[PDB]
Amino acid sequence: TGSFVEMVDNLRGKSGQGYYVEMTVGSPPQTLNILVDTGSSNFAVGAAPHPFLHRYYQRQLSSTYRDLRKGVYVPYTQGKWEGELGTDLVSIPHGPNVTVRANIAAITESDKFFINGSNWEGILGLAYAEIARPDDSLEPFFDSLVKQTHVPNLFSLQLCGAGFPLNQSEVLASVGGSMIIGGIDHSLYTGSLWYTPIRREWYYEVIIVRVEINGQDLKMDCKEYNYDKSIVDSGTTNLRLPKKVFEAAVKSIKAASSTEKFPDGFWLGEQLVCWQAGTTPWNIFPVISLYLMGEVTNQSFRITILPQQYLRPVEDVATSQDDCYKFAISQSSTGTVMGAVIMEGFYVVFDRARKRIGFAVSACHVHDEFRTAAVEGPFVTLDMEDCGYN
Ligand SMILES: CN(C)c1nc(N2CCCC2)nc2ccccc12
Ligand SMILES: [Cl-]
């Protein structure tokens, strides 16, 4: 650990639209806001006009451009981007102060990929080469940065949700957090770092062993928590959970928050819920705890999130006083996805060199006077490798 003072407060954005870092590409430098995505492995940037892009990468204006003369087709969940592969010199201004040659995918066509008014123009895929496209021989950005410079094979992410909804303009003002490249910044967390092993180097896959709602165990075969696979994914908004796990949690959260009642749509993430300015009854909503496999035999540790995390602020401007929120937990056929919602509670260390992911309580996590996110351990769990789906 130490102090990485230029890289602190370098991200902007929100859970609904993603978090981005300023990068430059080419000679002379072309500035672009790039989404930080731990759930993919391509460095891909808008390279042609699009209604939602205010600017883009212009290969014709860069002396250091080289065409790799291959195309790339990445289907997204719904829609796609299509790219022309190449290489160019790449920097991060509020970054490690080193320029590297990297594979860049010049996006030329795309559908349902860019977000309207998002203020990012590309994607920095930080995952491993195994899920890069067209295949693993395309070296990802981070692999290249390590090999070309002296930077340690490790990065860390502090995503900072504000307590309230942010406009298009306010996202640029409001600080969104920190990506630390090549290290761990001691001032971005309190208490201790607890590490879970990375199960496989493709996505950042982890093993969840136990789940609690206000200390109340969900009491399932822990294969159901990792049903298919569990991942840490900055490019996903919600905490996504498998079907059986999702329903059991919703029932448990409903019951704990029974002081009030909410429509069925709220629990399916569609309808807003709204209280008067400041009177959000956080105390009636329960904390959610995920136990992760520790790197010692028969040890787990616990990350605990608040309703401040799993209820995203979203404005309506129908009575502009009210504080409104959407339910930021949802169903998955992927297995568990620990999106921005979860990550906004914690400082997450991606220790690729030692094949593990660290968790600590974020200094910027949103909370009231009487509660706070936690990272706690150890806990003697038995048969934790049987929680893995294989
Ligand atoms: C930031 N997340 C939520 C993303 N949203 C969308 N939008 C969802 C509706 C249209 C596109 N596209 C992405 C593409 C890559 C990585 C993250 C995201
Ligand atoms: Cl989502």
Backbone angles phi, psi at 140, to 5 degrees: -70, 160
d(CA 255, CA 269): 18
Domains 19-151 and 152-390 share a fold: yes
- Token pair for residue 106? 């010049």
Torsion of CA 127, 128, 133, 136, to 10 degrees: 170
User: Catalytic site residue 233?
Assistant: yes
d(CA 142, CA 126): 6
Q: Which one, of 368, 360, 357, 177, lies nearest residue 284 by Cα?
A: 368
Nearest ligand, CA 39: 1
Spell out the residues 6+ positions from residue 173 whose beta carbon is closer than 8 angstroms to its own.
none
Q: Give 373's Cβ-side CA count (13 Å radius).
A: 29
Are 373 and 361 in contact by the 8 Å Cβ rule? The answer is: yes
CB of residue 37 inside a 6 A radius of ligand 1 = yes
Q: How was this structure determined?
A: X-ray
Count CB atoms within 10 A of the CB of residue 240. 25
Q: Which one, of 314, 10, 270, lies nearest residue 163 by Cα?
A: 314
Q: Ligand 1 atom closest to Cα of 235?
A: 17
d(CA 94, CA 8): 8
CB of residue 116 inside a 6 A radius of ligand 1 = no
User: How many angstroms separate the alpha carbon of residue 380 from the centre of ligand 1?
Assistant: 38
CB of residue 209 inside a 6 A radius of ligand 1 = no
Between strands 155-159 and 346-351, the pairing is antiparallel
Handedness of CA 187, 353, 126, 231 (dihedral sign): negative
Are 231 and 334 in contact by the 8 Å Cβ rule? The answer is: yes
- Give CA separation, 115 vs 19, 36, 161, 173, in Å: 12, 14, 19, 19
d(CA 111, CA 185): 38
Tell whether omega for the bond before 152 is within 30 degrees of 0, i.e. cis: no
Find tokens 């910044």 and name the residue.
185
Count CB atoms within 10 A of the CB of residue 6. 14
* Cα maximum dimension of the chain: 64
Query: What is the CATH number that goes with domain 152-390?
Result: 2.40.70.10
Spell out the residues 6+ positions from residue 343 whose beta carbon is closer than 8 angstroms to its own.
157, 159, 232, 234
Spell out the residues 6+ positions from residue 257 whose beta carbon is closer than 8 angstroms to its own.
284, 285, 286
Are 380 and 299 in contact by the 8 Å Cβ rule? The answer is: yes
How many angstroms separate the first and last alpha carbons of the chain?
35
The one catalytic residue among 88, 185, 233, 351: 233
d(CA 327, CA 58): 40
Count CB atoms within 10 A of the CB of residue 369. 5
Question: With helix as H, strand as E and coil as C, how does the chain read?
Answer: CECCCCCCCCEEEECCCEEEEEEEECCCCEEEEEEEECCCCCEEEECCCECCECCCCCHHHCCCCEEEEEEEEEECCCCEEEEEEEEEEEECCCCCCCCEEEEEEEEEEEECCCCCCCCCCEEEECCCHHHCCCCCCCCCHHHHHHHHCCCCCCEEEEECCCCCCCCHHHHHHCCCEEEEECCCEHHHEEEEEEEEECCCECCEEECEEEEEECCEECCCCCCCCCCCCEEECCCCCCEEECHHHHHHHHHHHHHHCCCCCCCHHHHCCCCCEEECCCCCCHHHCCCEEEEEECCCCCCEEEEEECHHHHEEECCCCCCCCCEEEEECEEECCCCCEECHHHHCCEEEEEEHHHCEEEEEEECCCCCCCCCCCEEEEEECCCCCHHHCCC
Q: Which one, of 122, 236, 171, 124, lies nearest residue 14 by Cα?
A: 171
Are 97 and 36 in contact by the 8 Å Cβ rule? The answer is: no
- Token pair for residue 102? 């990297």
d(CA 267, CA 263): 7
d(CA 378, CA 292): 10
User: Any idea which fold 19-151 has?
Assistant: Cathepsin D, subunit A; domain 1 (2.40.70)
Find tokens 């201790």 and name the residue.
192
- Token pair for residue 303? 């990350």
Q: Domain coordinates of the chain in residue numbers?
A: 19-151, 152-390
- Token pair for residue 39? 């759930």
d(CA 243, CA 331): 6
User: Catalytic site residue 217?
Assistant: no
The one catalytic residue among 37, 88, 185, 322: 37
d(CA 259, CA 281): 10
Q: Provide the edge-to-edge strand list for the sheet that holds 208-213.
A: 216-217, 208-213, 288-293, 300-305, 374-379
Residues in the chain: 390
- Give CA separation, 308 vs 280, 328, 380, in Å: 10, 10, 29
